[PDB]
RNA sequence: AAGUGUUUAAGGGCGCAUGGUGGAUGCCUUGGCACUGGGAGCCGAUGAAGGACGUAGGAGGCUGCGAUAAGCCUCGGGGAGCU
């Protein structure tokens, strides 16, 4: 999705906004998929990327 | 008139040529056995060994993986092929 350095240089408020929005997008796209009106898959994996990145960066900033 | 006599195979046996079933024989090795020289001699409450269940675009199974589910990041090695 974005560069890990992109959201490293991006702020905590923007990153929480992004985590909100991207959880929403995971939700929405994953279950449009589950509705089975689609053809591809990698969207779930990309949102996996973004969730893991946000979670890791939040731990990092919260720990030090 | 007389006495003399092969002349057939329902089947069978023997050989010969053909085949049929059964898979030994010969040839092969990703498999095993036994060693040598090295490495490592533990794994676990930061939740182990081993399992249930799930995980794919596709129904099951094996392999990996774990609702973040044939996987995710960051760093380094390779490439025009991969899912
Ligand atoms: Mg399995
Ligand atoms: Mg490298």
UniProtKB/Swiss-Prot annotation:
Show the GO cellular component annotation of the record. cytosolic large ribosomal subunit
Kindly state a single biological-process term from the GO annotations of this entry: translation
What keywords is this UniProt entry annotated with?
Ribonucleoprotein, Ribosomal protein
Q: Which domain of life is it from?
A: Bacteria
Tell me the GO molecular function terms.
structural constituent of ribosome
The reply to whether Nucleotide-binding figures as a keyword in the UniProt entry is no
> What does the sequence similarity comment in the record state about its family?
Belongs to the universal ribosomal protein uL29 family.
* Protein name, entry field: Large ribosomal subunit protein uL29
Q: Which organism is it from?
A: Mycolicibacterium smegmatis (strain ATCC 700084 / mc(2)155) (Mycobacterium smegmatis)
Full-sequence range covered: 4 to 67 of 77
């Amino acid at each position: 999705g974005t560069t890990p350095g992109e959201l490293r240089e991006l702020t905590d408020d923007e990153l929480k906004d992004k985590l909100r929005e991207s959880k929403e997008e995971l939700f929405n796209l994953r279950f449009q998929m589950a509705t089975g009106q689609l053809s591809n898959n990698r969207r779930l994996r990309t949102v996996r990327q973004e969730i893991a990145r946000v979670y890791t960066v939040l731990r990092e900033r919260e720990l030090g």
